[PDB]
Design a protein around this ligand. Structure first.
Ligand SMILES: O=c1ccn([C@@H]2O[C@H](COP(=O)(O)OP(=O)(O)O)[C@@H](O)[C@H]2O)c(=O)[nH]1
Length: 447
């Protein structure tokens, strides 16, 4: 089979690799999703065409990340148990008459490539972040840039035609520009690339037209092939596609609420599945939303919602809806959706692009500051919130950015760019498109 090993944490996102796997199954390959025992027992399996299998991260009954909140210690524990149990899985698969043909893995777990290579299984790295960020990490790994990475280093790469934007201090990836703040994440980011040259294939969830210089450099430097955006075929208009109302229509109550709002009127608001906001930050964000006067759909996770006051929740009742989780793709495809106030995680960004939704970017760390710069400066599909002198986001700034995207003199600029990139994203994944071609090549290689 083809084994698919997304980053084996509950906080990891399996769907981009599953959508790659669905495309491989269309070409006749047989995919298995490999997750932790904890994830397997706490989420529904993917269903046809997938098998499921498990490894362990040390914690089969509880969440390893809650147990081990120091990131370095969680990652060392995952490596020790994961590598052992992955080896055991490769053997048990072979003994069950399903020897793995290839292991597709997120190199944010680079021990997986060692284990598979030692089992004589081909390996394909699946980069889950944008080429722009990936190449900066790769230059550090390759010892072409020292730590910390500076805006001067970034300006060099722009000048050499590698980066298509000039990154300032608030735009360079903090895990390498401020590595003392997050030692384990700095190491994780760089070690993604350590030994990547030994893989059979290297894949990235992006498309060439979005980041042309960066994807070209990733291809020539790391053999990376673009295979995205790795989203459901429906949202890419890929029939293997006529008039636009979502045929993949759920019963989720927030969708009923969106159905009653006017076209392009609603602000979707999410800071993703990992970041935590303190009470003060939630208060500035929620008041900004209320102060905007727009309808809004605010995702506040179950594990965060204790921080919302009664009074702010009531204020949000006037025009807003607060939910713990939404069907974000379905939301973004909805005719009522006008803009997305996002932390600019890459999956959320790609989902916004495929649906032509303009962005208000509120980045925290990882790839988000970089993505937010591309959003505002190269892609032109939205604006980034400006923090005050002490690094605080103020309610007045939240409000001003919402208004600027929905009502400002440049409203039509952001919409125009979003629509333009939407069309190119779809093209890339349709038959004969730049990403589709790389998927087909891979599939033939492993048939
Ligand atoms: O209410 C929500 C919040 C998030 N997501 C999905 O969760 C992923 C979040 O990934 P992202 O890279 O944006 O950031 P993270 O959450 O890892 O910071 C995306 O696929 C979202 O569509 C969702 O479906 N519903």
């Amino acid at each position: 089979q083809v084994l698919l090993l997304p980053f084996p944490a509950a906080q990891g996102h399996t769907n981009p690799m599953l959508q790659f796997g669905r495309r491989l199954a269309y070409h006749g390959l047989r995919p298995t999703l490999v997750t932790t025992r904890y994830v397997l027992s706490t989420t529904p399996p993917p269903g046809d065409p997938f098998r499921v299998a498990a490894i362990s991260d040390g914690f089969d009954d509880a969440s390893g990340m809650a147990a081990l909140p120091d990131p370095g210690e969680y990652l060392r524990t995952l490596e020790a148990h994961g590598a052992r149990t992955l080896a055991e899985l490769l053997l048990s698969e072979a003994r069950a008459g399903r020897p793995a043909r290839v292991l597709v893995y997120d190199p944010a777990a680079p021990w997986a490539r060692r284990v598979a290579r030692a089992a004589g299984v081909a390996t394909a790295a699946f980069l889950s972040q944008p080429c722009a960020v990936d190449l900066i990490y790769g230059e550090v790994c390759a010892r072409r840039l020292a730590l910390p990475v500076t805006p001067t280093d970034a300006r060099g790469l722009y000048a050499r035609g590698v980066l298509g934007v000039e990154l300032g201090p608030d735009d360079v990836p903090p895990f390498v520009a401020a590595p003392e703040l997050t030692p384990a994440f700095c190491e994780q980011s760089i070690e993604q690339f350590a030994g990547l040259e030994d893989d059979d294939d290297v894949l990235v969830n992006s498309f060439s037209d979005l980041e042309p210089k960066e994807a070209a450099y990733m291809e020539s430097t790391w053999r990376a092939k673009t295979i995205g955006p790795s989203l459901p075929s429906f949202y890419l208009d890929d029939g293997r596609t006529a008039y636009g109302f979502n045929l993949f229509r759920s019963t989720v109550p927030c969708m009923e609420w969106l159905d009653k709002q006017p076209p392009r009127s609603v602000v979707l608001v999410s800071y993703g599945t990992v970041s935590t906001f303190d009470v003060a930050k939630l208060e500035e964000l929620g008041n900004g939303l209320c102060n905007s006067g727009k309808p809004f759909l605010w995702v506040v996770r179950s594990n965060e919602e204790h921080k919302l006051s009664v009074q702010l929740r009531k204020k949000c009742e006037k025009r807003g809806l607060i939910v713990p989780f939404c069907p974000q793709l379905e939301v973004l495809a909805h005719k009522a959706t006008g803009c997305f106030l996002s932390h600019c995680g890459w999956n959320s960004t790609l989902e916004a692009i495929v649906n032509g939704v303009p962005l208000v970017a509120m980045p925290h760390w990882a790839d988000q500051p970089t993505i937010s710069k591309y959003v505002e400066s190269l892609w032109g599909m939205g604006v980034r919130v400006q923090l005050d002198k002490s690094g605080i986001l103020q309610r007045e700034e939240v409000e001003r950015c919402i208004r600027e995207v929905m009502d400002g003199d440049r409203k039509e600029d952001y919409r125009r760019n979003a629509t333009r990139l939407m069309k190119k994203a779809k093209e890339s994944m349709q038959e004969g498109g730049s990403s589709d071609k790389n998927i087909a090549e891979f599939a033939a290689k492993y048939s």
